[PDB]
Every structure is written in structure tokens, then in C-alpha cells.
Design a protein around this ligand. Sequence first.
Ligand code: CLR
Lengths: 579, 588
Amino acid sequence: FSSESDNSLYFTYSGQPNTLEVRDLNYQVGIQNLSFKVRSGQMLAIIGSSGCGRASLLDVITGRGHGGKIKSGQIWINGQPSSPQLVRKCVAHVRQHNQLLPNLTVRETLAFIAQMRLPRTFSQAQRDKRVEDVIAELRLRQCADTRVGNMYVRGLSGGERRRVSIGVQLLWNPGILILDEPTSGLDSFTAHNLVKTLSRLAKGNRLVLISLHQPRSDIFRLFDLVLLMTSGTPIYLGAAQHMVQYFTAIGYPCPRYSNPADFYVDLTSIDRRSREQELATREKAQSLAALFLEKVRDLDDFLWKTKMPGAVQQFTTLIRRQISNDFRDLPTLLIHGAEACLMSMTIGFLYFGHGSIQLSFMDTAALLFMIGALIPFNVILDVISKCYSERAMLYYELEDGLYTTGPYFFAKILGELPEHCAYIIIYGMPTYWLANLRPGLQPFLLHFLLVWLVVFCCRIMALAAAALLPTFHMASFFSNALYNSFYLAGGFMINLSSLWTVPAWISKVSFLRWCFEGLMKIQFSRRTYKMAVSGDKILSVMELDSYPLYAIYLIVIGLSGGFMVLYYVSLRFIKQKPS
Amino acid sequence: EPHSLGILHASYSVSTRQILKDVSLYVESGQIMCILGSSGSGKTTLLDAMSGRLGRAGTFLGEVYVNGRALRREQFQDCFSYVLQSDTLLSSLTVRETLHYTALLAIRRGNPGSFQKKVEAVMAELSLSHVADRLIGNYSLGGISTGERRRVSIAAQLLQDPKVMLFDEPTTGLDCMTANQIVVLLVELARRNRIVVLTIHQPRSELFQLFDKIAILSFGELIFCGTPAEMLDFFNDCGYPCPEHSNPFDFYMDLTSVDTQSKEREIETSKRVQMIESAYKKSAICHKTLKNIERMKHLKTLPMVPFKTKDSPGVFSKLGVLLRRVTRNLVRNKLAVITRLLQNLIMGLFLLFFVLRVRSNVLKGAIQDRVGLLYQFVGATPYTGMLNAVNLFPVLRAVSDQESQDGLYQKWQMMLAYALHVLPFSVVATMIFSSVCYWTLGLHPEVARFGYFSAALLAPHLIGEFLTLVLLGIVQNPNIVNSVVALLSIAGVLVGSGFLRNIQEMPIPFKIISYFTFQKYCSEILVVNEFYGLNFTCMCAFTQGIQFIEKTCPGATSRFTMNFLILYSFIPALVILGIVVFKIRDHL
Ligand SMILES: CC(C)CCC[C@@H](C)[C@H]1CC[C@H]2[C@@H]3CC=C4C[C@@H](O)CC[C@]4(C)[C@H]3CC[C@]12C
């Protein structure tokens, strides 16, 4: 045998057993016709066939499936007809593949969510009670203070990630807790002890539902109610320890030394490699279903044998959780630091204007353009890459509804500035000194700030492309088109006056052009330049005269302004599908 | 013919824990052996031990006997077939084609008519003669099915006629029916005077009474080996009957694995493991194994030759197989040939979108516009060539690597085939690009001008693609190599070409590392093709074009003959480097 120890309850559901019953559901791409009534305290496991419109069943019952629509049939939750409100208010969904932030602890991941799921009327002590109560019920009193690192590899084990993934639903004490493939990837010993941790959760006056493909032999002995299917048609529903009796009595009885679940799952299988194969057993599946619903047609159950957190507080909670994670991620910091450093020196040394001969004029123009035009090459890829790492997290958090697009929009733009400012300093200041540029603190700062805004403008661009296009290689291609366009119409590789009307207006809104036109105005504003010549007819020759320096900052802020409008509309209306 | 495979002892360690301990096994012809084991059992490692696909990465002091004779480490590939649990097949070939090209790479004797007999032969036994001449393609309803892929791979291994077949978890990603079908197919293959040894993860109840010998490893130690009848008796005599409705696989696996969730149960279950394992080593069935293997050594009843039979065609004949094997994969693929040929024309149409004509007036952009176009070309020509490799080569890599261990060909022979069939498309691709926008930009209309321009950019387009091969030979993730190569071309033209930094006045290392950029010599060529015969109209410094050729890349007009020979010589350099880079990949 496996393991035996404490099985006392610590966190129970404080309400009446809320019920869920479904009367005659027909769904298609799916499921043809099912009927049952379940109550809290029960744990119903579905066995069914492999991915035969039933790993979509817990999405049809919650009303959030896809690839079809509910075609007939009623769904009752606590005696109430199904609606996304009752699904957000009653049913705690544990997604098989969800993400948690890697560089936080079990307490922290639960606490940050607990400050967004429990009512505002809870004191911090009440909310701390609920986090500890969840930990203690899920047997996470051990290992609560460790990192939940997944790509950080070292940390908690797969069974503990799952236990932490359930707690993120147990934090708001659900009455109906449905799990989809809880024993995926899990060890035989781990899968067994995790099922018991759910058996105790249903014993805590909850209604626990389990979709589960090919159970092991030991896990089938731990089911309470059990639903056996073949595809869209159900075969048998009732107490697990009687599935042998119900089926021994109807004429396909259950052999010795064989897991009943993986014996009867194959017994109603419908194969597809032949027209006569698939002809035969869908006749067997519809026939076998036709005889269980009347063996329990006269028998009932069809059973054989508060104000929430506001936008501000969520902003405060999201901006913490984001900034708290990303500053423990020391590996990606040091690399993104060096990729700025080693680069800010590659630019500076090619145009080294000190220990040799002073910078030529066109040598000084190329430097200023490159400084601006070379920054999106790194900036685009990773700002995009960070988003796509978070869409697994962002989707289920925005769907379950613990925050609006509002707070995340402001949390997403600001949690990167603490990082962003270090990146620019490491990139911006060394190039300015190595190449002999116009001395003084006033020019140096204006140089720093425009580049800060242009890279910030570019962050808001790449950030917006990631939430707007479906996939990475399309978002990557779209921001590289803008970058390639903003590069050509930047005003160095081609003449501004010899611009086709649309490249003329493309230059008007290219933040790579305003970086070049601005920095060319900071270096050659009023200084006289050594062949001397005053900087002004110099810039007038290269049509950098109009639009004084301060406007260049306003324009670039306006360009980042428009991108922000794009990004908020993108998040709020375009859903963020992972992978 | 008592054809048999044995292991007198078996051990393996890395450096510095150990992975296998005294694994002693004996299987006969006609038997299908099943190897269960929990994670870290090393059951995956034991299969690699027999097929001899470890080599010398650790220390193996075991002995592998075949037909009463001991095998050298050099004769393990010379006898055994071995198929991976995830089969990689080129998606643009049919099943006959995949088997045909496989058949071509395996035998050296002639008569191509009797190859269609053997390709057709292996499609009968595995029920794929129905779907031969059909495209493999993608998944279930839009190509070939999952089990049919598994059988195409089993057909490719059957064309060599190995007498021992080691399967690694062949029922991992399969249906309840197809995974049962494959087990059914495997049990037929063994009874036909063949040895089938496979490992299984979640062995369903039905599979039990079907295997001839089942054996369990737990951390390299052999816990049990015997027949399902001998097994049920053994753990019953040890004191553990099979529960009423429990899968004996699901039971004895749990019974002989080490729970590690607690210090107490790891000590506990290991104490239980040590009783079961030790009681087995003193078993009649255990010593029946060791008595059998050396009974095989000193019975001079059937000694034999190693199998698969060592007939190897040469290198020049093998490249021809892979050359038309890959070209048929690319041209039958409609998307890739279009993209491979047109992305230079799209690059060129995008520039022409922004700058229509060149304008010969110095003040309206006579040289500013000229310097930009050559920079964009010398800069983005190696990039588009790279996109070809990171998109289309990683799949041909996985094909090469499966087949490189199996002895069809060596990894470098793959890239040389790949090196060669990209030649026609790339040459045509830059002509699609040159012929269109050169005359439209209006650079300089003499016919000889256009001719040099086309060739001058074919090299960076080949260099950028060939460099991406030699990198992909030692970097696995192509998303990284995409990040690397693009960084190197932006670095290459920014330093090597005198455009954005006059090659004469930049600091010493940038002069030095300039002479190693393929961009330096490309620009020295292209800066001449346009600025030589020009004269301008109009501050306004340069009047006739020979002056700008002097300001940057001075004297380059003299070196025009040499600057082409240099630029084009990098192409044979990368291919040679790749060959050596892929023989290093042979050991990683
Ligand atoms: C064989 C040739 C064609 C390959 C391409 C040219 C190679 C050798 C040259 C061209 C540009 C060069 C790079 C340009 C800039 C730097 C900055 C320095 O801080 C690290 C080395 C590094 C990264 C250089 C390494 C060598 C380099 C990659």
C-alpha cells in the first residue's frame, strides 16, 4: 500500500450542499444525451473515452466550451439555470495547464491572489487566515515557504505545483470545484495521495468533479460516484464499488486481474478505421445507453447504488506581484544588462572621437541615427517575448475575473519602467562618452531623455503588437515591418525631401526619425562645429530645422500615446488566447 | 535455430552516480519481452545499451552475447534495429517514397526493380500497402494517421532485415485502439523468428497475458524477469497477491517502485524493494537465466554472423539519394519554394516602395540614396538567406539524426545534400529580385552593370544561409540562431563596409575585424558598379562618381577582380566548416 497519515479536515465549505443537475444535454462539434443530479459531499469522476467530446464536457457544463454550442438540454446549478455569472460565482475551475509566477513562494502566490479574491470587507488577518487554512488543508504546511519555480526548475515538485494550483481556486471557498485531468504527469504515489486530498475536499461539503482518462487500478478504488461513457452517449453512472455488479448483471461482466475502468472503456469503444467497424459499435454505444437510462428511469438522481476589490487595489496588487517576481529573476537581469553594456560599447568604440581624429560630420550623423534605430532590435523581441510568456497566466486571470483590463493595462506598462531605466542608462551613457559628443550636463540629459522616450515609445509599440495579433511569428513580423519602415523613413538611409507622399507621412510618425532629428538638434543646436561653422545652417541643410527640440519630445510622447490607445483597446476586446 | 540474445552482466555509470546494475537478461527468438519501470529506472538506458548506441560516454563492463558468441562494441549497430518513440518522417514524401529512399540508402547491390519488390514487401506485412503512394502529410484526418506513421517507421527498419528489434515506448502517443494495434503488430513480428524487446509506461490490463517475458528495473537493479505465469507465482510466494480488480501491471509496478514523497517512505519502500529484489536473485527463474546464457556460450550448436549485413554504398552514391530525397521534399512542398524565391523580391519591393528613382542630383539625394540602397542590400541579403535555414532545415535535421544513428548515412552527408539543392533557388531568387527593381530604381542602365550586381548579392544570400547551417549544427534552438545570425549581419555591414564608418579612420580592431567580414568585399564591389560611370548635377562636394569610390574603399577599382574571388570564396569555406561542424555534432 501507499501512504497513511493525517486525514483531518482543516478548511471546509461553510454553506449548504449546492446542487448541480443536468437534464438531457446534447452538444456537438460532442455529447448526445445525459441526465444526473449531484450534491456537495460527493466526488464524481468521469472516465469516458479518450478525448471524445468529454475533456470538453467540463467546458460545456460551465458554458465555456468551444467548437460547438449546447444544442438542447438544461443545466442547473443550485437549482438555477446555467449562466456565466453562476459559473463565475459557483464553480472553481482548475485548469490542467496554467502558469504561476516562477519566482514567488507558495504563500506569496496564494496571498497575492487572496488580496484579489476575498471581499474588501476582510481584514488582512482574515485573508491571512484563509491562505493558511488552504495551505494546511492541502498538506502544504510543509514546503509553504519555498519558491514555486517551474523553469526555475529547482523548487517544489509537480504534485506540489498542482496542490498550489488548486489552492488558487480554494482561496475563495468554492462549493463546486471541478478538476480537469488532475493526474496528468503525476507519479503513481503522488496521483494517489492527491486524489485523497480531493476526497477530503469533497468531504468538506464540496461538490468535486473529475474528468480522468485511463485511471490506474488503485485510483479507481478511490472514486465515489463514477460516470462511464463511450463518446457523446453515457453508459453508466453510480457508485464506483458497484460498477462490477451493474455490469456483471447486464451481460458484459468484469474479469479478474483487470482494472474495470480500462476494461470497460475499451468495451464501448467506437473505432474509425473502417466503415463497418464504426458502424457496429456506435450501434453498441447507443444501444447500451438505451438500457441504462431505463434501469434508473424510475429510480431518482439517475444514481445507480459582498463588495469586491476595486480597480485601484488590483493595480496595487498586480504591480506588486509583477515587480516582486521579476526582480528575483537575477539570471535574466544580468543578461539583459550585458546585452545593453557590451552593445553601448560596440557603438561607442566604432565612433570613438577622442584618442585619434575627431568625429567627421556624417560620422556624427550615423552615430545619432544608429543609437535610436538600433534599439528596437533587442527591445522588440523580448517585450513581445515577455507577453507571450504571460498569456497562459493573463487569460485565466482575466476570464475568472479577479481583475479587469483596466488595472493590468496600467500594471503592465509601469512594472517594466524600474527595469527599463537601468537598461537605458547602461545603453545610453557609455555611447555618449566614448564617441566625443557635445560636452555639458544639459546636452547629456536631453540626449538621455529622448532616447528614454523613444525606447519607451517602442516598448508601448511592441507591447501592443503582442496583444493584438494571434501568434508570436505574426506579431514578430508586424513589429519588424514597423521597425523596417520606421528605419527607412527614419531620414538617414533616404532623403526626407525625396519621399513619396506615403513615406513622407510615414516619416512624420516614425519615432526613429524624431530620435534622429532630436539628437541632431541636441548636438548641433547652437555650437559652432570644427572642420568653424555654426550648427544651424548645418541642420537646415538636412531639413532638421523646423519642429524645435521640445516638440520632438511632445511628438514622441504622442506616438507612445497613440500606441497606448491601441494597446488598451487590444486587451479589452481581443481575447488573449495562449499558444 | 535456437537464435538467442543474452546479457551475461550489465552495468553503466556516468561522471558520478551509476545507472544500471547487474542487468542479466535472456530472450529467445519468437519471444516478445516487455520492460516496465518507473521514472529513472534506466529502462530507456538499457535499450540503448543493447543497440550499442551509447558507445563510450560512460563505462560498460557487461557482456552482450548473440548466438553463443560475444559481440564487440563495434558490432552492436551491426545486428540490432532500434526505433525511437517519436518518429520523424519527411512530410512531403509518400510512404512508397519514404521506404524507397530508405531502401536506397541500405543496400549496395543493384537491380532497382527488385527494390520495388522489397519496398512493396514491407508494406504488405504492416498493412501500409493500402496507403502507399499516398502523401504522409500532417495528422489524422488531414494526412496519415498516428499508427500508420508508427508502421511507416517500422517498415523503414524492416527493409534492413534485422534479427533483433528494440522498441522504445512504441505506445506512448497512441489511442486505446492504435496502441493496442501496435502491440498486436509487435507480437506477430516476434513469433516470426525475430526478437522484439520493448518498454511500456502505462501497460493496460490486456497487455499482460500477451508478453513472453516481463522484467522490472528500479534504479538499474533488475527486480524480476520471467513469464507472466512465473511472475504471478513469484510475488504470491513473496506474499503479495493481485487484488480483485487491480491491473497486475498497475499493482506490481507500485509494489516495486520507490516512493520518495517522504524520508520515511523512501527508506520504507526501499526496504520492501530490497526484499523483493534480493529474493529474486536467489530464485530458480533468476538462475535459470544465468544457466541458460552460458549454456549458449559453450554449446557449439548454432554460431552465426552478425545481421543487417554490412553492405555500404559509397559517399557519392549516398549524397545523390539525399539530394533528390530533399529536393522532392522541397518542390512538392508548395509554400516553401515560393517563399524561398520571393523574399528577396519582397525586400526589394519594400525599398522601391519608399524610394522610387535614384535622382542624379547631388542635393536631392544623388549619393545619400545610393549609399542607402547598397547598405540595405549588403545588410538584408544575408538575413533573408538565413531565414531559409532556420525555417526549413530543423525538420531535415531530426530526420538526419534518427537515420545517422541507424546507419543510413553520416550527419554531414545531410547538409551537403542540403547545401546543393538550395543553389538553384537562391541563384534564381536574386535574379527575380535584381531583374525587377534594379531597372526600376534606375541605378545605372548598362547591361554589364546589372550582370555584376546580380552575382555580387548572390554570395551574401548564400553566405547567410550556409552560416546558419554550421550554427544549427551545434546550436539546437533555431529561434536563437535566428537571433544570432541577424546580430552578425547587422554587425557585419556596420563594420565591414565603409558606408557608416569610413574604413580608414576607425580604430584598429574595427579595421582588423573588417578584413574578415564578407560584407567588406561585397560593398567594395557594389560601390564600384554604380559610382564608376556617373556624373552629377547641382554642400555639393562630389561631382563625378570616381570621387566617392575614392573617399571610401580607396583603390577598390583596382581590386575588383580580387574582391569577387574573395567574396565568393566564403561559400566553399562554410560548406567545409559545416562538414567538420557536423562530425562534432556526431558526438553530442
Ligand atoms: C567567417 C565570417 C564571414 C563570419 C562573419 C564575420 C565575423 C568573423 C565577424 C564579423 C563581425 C564580428 C563581430 C562584430 C562585433 C563584435 C563586438 C565585440 O565586442 C565581440 C565580437 C563581435 C561580436 C565580432 C566577432 C567577429 C565578427 C562576428
